[PDB]
Amino acid sequence: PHELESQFILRLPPEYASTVRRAVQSGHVNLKDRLTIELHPDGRHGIVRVDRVPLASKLVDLPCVMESLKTIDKKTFYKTADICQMLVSTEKKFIWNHGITLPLKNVRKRRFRKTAKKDVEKEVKRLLSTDAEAVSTRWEIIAED
Amino acid sequence: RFSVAEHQERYKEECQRIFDLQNKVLSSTEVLSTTASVTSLNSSATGRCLKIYRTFRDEEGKEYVRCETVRKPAVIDAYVRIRTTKDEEF
Amino acid sequence: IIQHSIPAVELRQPFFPTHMGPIKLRQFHRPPLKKYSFGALSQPGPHSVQPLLKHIKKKAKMREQERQASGGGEMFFMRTPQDLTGKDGDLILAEYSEENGPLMMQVGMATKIKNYYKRKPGKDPGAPDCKYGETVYCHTSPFLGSLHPGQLLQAFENNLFRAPIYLHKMPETDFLIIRTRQGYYIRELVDIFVVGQQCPLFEVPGPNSKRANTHIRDFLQVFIYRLFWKSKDRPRRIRMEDIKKAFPSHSESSIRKRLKLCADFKRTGMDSNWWVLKSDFRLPTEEEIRAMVSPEQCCAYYSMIAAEQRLKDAGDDEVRTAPWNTTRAFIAAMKGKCLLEVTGVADPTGCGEGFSYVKIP
């Protein structure tokens, strides 16, 4: 079978980004030893090791949706993957408010129409299980108390 | 009392001006400095929280009762919507 | 005019899913980073990224050899799923301004970049030249506004929408990591477009519409025909629980309705518990199956069911912002049926920027 490739964006500190960029544009396999990525079983934490120097990483959710588009003639572009995550290196914390481009900054706060967390469904599933495992349930919409 | 050219031209100019503004906004390479003020809703129209009493049996012999209060209007809506639907499933 | 990849026009399941559940409809076009169970990345620990520069230039030199061996004209290259990898070719990125657009391309579909250039009054030097796309001189503005004299505007143009794009240079810190089961791979990016508000050219159907139910029935029929084509036994035969694995929300009465014509169930003897193909039934050819369902209809259906989920999760203003209403409003405005209030609540920005596509008389 075929599995859709999973592309994400890696953001590095600027000096480390310059060393990684020089090693990528060089093209040797020396970069392969120099740059490693360890993703922790949290799923939202990691180390990126540039030249064997550890950097602390967080995999965050991006507010917009990006799409990689490949081409052979620079006139027709074929969509290859959807990018929604970024492993910035240096829950609410794992959500990025800004977009990658310069015009998109504070997009989630200003350029996004109010949208719901769809979280609440999981919380309701937790309450329903407790109700069904009980015997007697008493409910009242309340006031200030 | 125009019901024709006035409406059409007004719509056209709002379209062109809006488009121009959008073009100016997106192609900006100006750096933007890093919550936007919004109306804050009350705990629902009624301003009412939800409290649930649960009766369970512990190991050996016991009959403890748990009173749990849900102050989140979002959890409330989804909870009681299901309860009202169930009241009608029978 | 738009020629999608052969995985896209044949509606392969990895790229065009048969069924999307609720947690997969909430993560529509935002696929999370999945953990592998088997493979090299499934073992926990540090993993080296691998620089592909020799792979990119080897594949580009090989494709140029293929093009010059075929007479030197323009060629069609995306014939396999392995052509749609990010490991080769010139990648650009495309960011969207809206959170949830009314229409959005699936993986494997093609789009074009058109540079609309309105000449200056009288003499003009020529279109400011651009790295990507082809230039066209537009007297009649494609979008809602009109181009200024001497203004070039790039745009994504395909069958789904048409949207103004704006080329920005990438940040100096961001690279692109393509992870697969075997390892990590890194490219740099230099070009990233920002896509403005889309102008929809395809109408998203409504829920329980006639076009909606027709697309569901035709998609199920195309999947059944392609399972019959994949069958190796001579009286081609399929199993029902393959279709029940693909479409699990379907009642089995509908699947048996699709299999009633073109197949019959064998209970006993040979081919038992199989749905063999009827001997008088001619299985349709590849071009007929391609003419049954279009990929843009699948994208419109996916937009409808994703918007159905978002509205369902959020308990009339929101209903107006649903893509069936907004696509109907914009296409009706383009024929001149009706006008749109350009300031309203269907505005995907939430501020004065951007349009709202809801009908006004």
Side-chain angles (χ1 to χ4, degrees), chain C residues 185-220:
Chain C
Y185 297 105
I186 173 163
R187 306 191 52 154
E188 61 189 339
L189 262 292
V190 62
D191 303 325
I192 176 166
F193 286 80
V194 194
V195 181
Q197 171 141 8
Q198 318 175 353
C199 304
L201 310 182
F202 205 90
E203 176 199 312
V204 174
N208 269 354
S209 171
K210 189 187 60 189
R211 178 63 247 161
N213 300 327
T214 307
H215 174 263
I216 303 179
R217 152 180 66 219
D218 291 9
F219 198 70
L220 177 50

Side-chain angles (χ1 to χ4, degrees), chain A residues 1-14 16-18 20-21 23-39 41 43-44 49 59 62-86 99-104 107-108 110-118 121 125, chain C residues 3-5 14-15 26 29-33 45-51 53 63 67 74 76-78 81 83-86 88-100 104-113 131-134 156 168 171-180 184 186 188 192 194 313-314 321 345-351 353:
Chain A
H2 183 272
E3 302 313 329
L4 278 182
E5 52 185 8
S6 176
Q7 319 180 2
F8 61 95
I9 291 280
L10 158 73
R11 161 157 316 167
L12 283 150
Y16 294 112
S18 90
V20 172
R21 171 165 318 276
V24 161
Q25 294 177 336
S26 159
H28 296 115
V29 285
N30 179 19
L31 161 71
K32 175 170 174 57
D33 335 333
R34 293 161 37 99
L35 185 49
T36 72
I37 291 180
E38 181 162 15
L39 213 66
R44 322 289 276 197
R49 225 173 310 272
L59 186 78
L62 293 176
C64 319
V65 47
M66 282 177 287
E67 45 171 22
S68 301
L69 264 73
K70 79 184 289 191
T71 188
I72 315 298
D73 45 71
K74 286 182 183 43
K75 289 171 159 38
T76 318
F77 292 83
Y78 295 82
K79 182 185 181 165
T80 80
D82 270 296
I83 313 171
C84 55
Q85 266 169 337
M86 195 166 59
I100 276 191
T101 61
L102 272 187
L104 301 180
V107 216
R108 223 150 196 157
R110 185 264 305 196
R111 257 223 170 205
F112 274 173
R113 63 193 330 172
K114 305 182 183 183
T115 38
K117 286 306 179 179
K118 299 185 202 167
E121 186 153 330
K125 288 165 176 170
Chain C
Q3 203 169 14
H4 313 299
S5 44
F15 318 100
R26 294 176 196 129
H29 288 319
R30 292 155 168 94
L33 205 73
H47 295 296
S48 276
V49 315
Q50 324 182 29
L53 177 42
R63 286 176 180 140
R67 166 179 279 145
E74 93 99 17
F76 184 76
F77 287 113
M78 327 295 285
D83 307 331
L84 285 156
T85 61
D88 42 42
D90 204 70
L91 262 67
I92 67 168
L93 255 57
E95 193 148 65
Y96 282 80
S97 293
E98 318 159 334
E99 177 168 22
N100 311 294
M104 212 89 75
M105 276 200 318
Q106 296 290 122
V107 167
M109 282 180 55
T111 193
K112 287 181 163 285
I113 293 193
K131 190 180 165 185
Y132 294 109
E134 70 206 79
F156 278 163
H168 281 265
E172 299 281 287
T173 54
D174 303 9
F175 306 95
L176 172 82
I177 319 290
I178 311 150
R179 84 192 272 270
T180 52
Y184 295 100
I186 173 163
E188 61 189 339
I192 176 166
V194 194
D313 290 353
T321 75
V345 309
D347 181 275
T349 293
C351 317
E353 306 140 349

Side-chain angles (χ1 to χ4, degrees), chain C residues 221-238:
Chain C
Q221 194 58 73
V222 161
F223 180 79
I224 283 172
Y225 286 154
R226 294 207 177 277
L227 281 201
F228 267 121
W229 269 116
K230 215 184 286 171
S231 177
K232 273 176 291 302
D233 309 315
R234 293 182 183 174
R236 308 170 165 275
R237 47 188 217 178
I238 60 171

Side-chain angles (χ1 to χ4, degrees), chain C residues 56-331:
Chain C
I56 293 179
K57 76 172 64 174
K58 271 310 277 187
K59 210 64 72 181
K61 175 192 309 165
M62 166 196 301
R63 286 176 180 140
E64 186 58 40
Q65 285 181 356
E66 293 185 4
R67 166 179 279 145
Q68 294 315 296
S70 73
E74 93 99 17
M75 215 176 161
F76 184 76
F77 287 113
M78 327 295 285
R79 296 181 170 156
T80 331
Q82 292 98 39
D83 307 331
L84 285 156
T85 61
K87 304 209 281 174
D88 42 42
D90 204 70
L91 262 67
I92 67 168
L93 255 57
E95 193 148 65
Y96 282 80
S97 293
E98 318 159 334
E99 177 168 22
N100 311 294
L103 279 168
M104 212 89 75
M105 276 200 318
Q106 296 290 122
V107 167
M109 282 180 55
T111 193
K112 287 181 163 285
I113 293 193
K114 299 284 171 63
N115 315 324
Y116 299 103
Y117 176 66
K118 192 163 192 175
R119 321 193 216 251
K120 292 168 196 63
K123 211 36 176 288
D124 90 274
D129 189 68
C130 328
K131 190 180 165 185
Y132 294 109
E134 70 206 79
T135 179
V136 282
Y137 310 103
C138 87
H139 52 303
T140 165
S141 186
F143 328 74
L144 281 190
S146 200
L147 274 191
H148 283 51
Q151 173 188 0
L152 174 138
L153 195 61
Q154 309 207 23
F156 278 163
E157 198 257 347
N158 50 0
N159 295 310
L160 274 183
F161 50 87
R162 183 190 304 116
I165 65 187
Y166 309 99
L167 174 59
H168 281 265
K169 32 178 59 180
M170 274 278 299
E172 299 281 287
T173 54
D174 303 9
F175 306 95
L176 172 82
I177 319 290
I178 311 150
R179 84 192 272 270
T180 52
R181 196 169 295 278
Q182 290 89 28
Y184 295 100
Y185 297 105
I186 173 163
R187 306 191 52 154
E188 61 189 339
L189 262 292
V190 62
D191 303 325
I192 176 166
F193 286 80
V194 194
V195 181
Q197 171 141 8
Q198 318 175 353
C199 304
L201 310 182
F202 205 90
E203 176 199 312
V204 174
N208 269 354
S209 171
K210 189 187 60 189
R211 178 63 247 161
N213 300 327
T214 307
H215 174 263
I216 303 179
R217 152 180 66 219
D218 291 9
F219 198 70
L220 177 50
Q221 194 58 73
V222 161
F223 180 79
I224 283 172
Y225 286 154
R226 294 207 177 277
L227 281 201
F228 267 121
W229 269 116
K230 215 184 286 171
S231 177
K232 273 176 291 302
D233 309 315
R234 293 182 183 174
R236 308 170 165 275
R237 47 188 217 178
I238 60 171
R239 282 220 212 263
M240 162 68 76
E241 40 252 356
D242 284 24
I243 321 178
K244 280 168 56 187
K245 269 192 293 275
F247 301 88
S249 86
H250 269 72
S251 45
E252 319 178 55
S253 318
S254 54
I255 314 172
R256 286 201 281 261
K257 258 188 279 197
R258 304 266 69 80
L259 295 158
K260 168 195 54 186
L261 48 89
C262 86
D264 40 350
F265 192 65
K266 299 298 173 200
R267 288 198 149 87
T268 187
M270 199 59 259
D271 312 282
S272 89
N273 309 148
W274 289 80
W275 285 85
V276 294
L277 190 85
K278 280 167 153 83
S279 300
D280 47 66
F281 182 77
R282 168 197 50 108
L283 210 44
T285 73
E286 167 69 34
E287 198 91 340
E288 301 183 36
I289 299 172
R290 283 182 206 191
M292 276 169 205
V293 192
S294 168
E296 291 91 8
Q297 305 185 14
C298 314
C299 304
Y301 180 72
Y302 293 154
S303 311
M304 181 259 287
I305 58 172
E308 211 192 34
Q309 179 69 193
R310 287 194 293 269
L311 272 160
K312 204 157 313 182
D313 290 353
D316 168 43
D317 311 12
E318 208 165 355
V319 180
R320 294 196 295 275
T321 75
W324 39 98
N325 296 329
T326 75
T327 43
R328 278 177 56 84
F330 190 80
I331 298 170

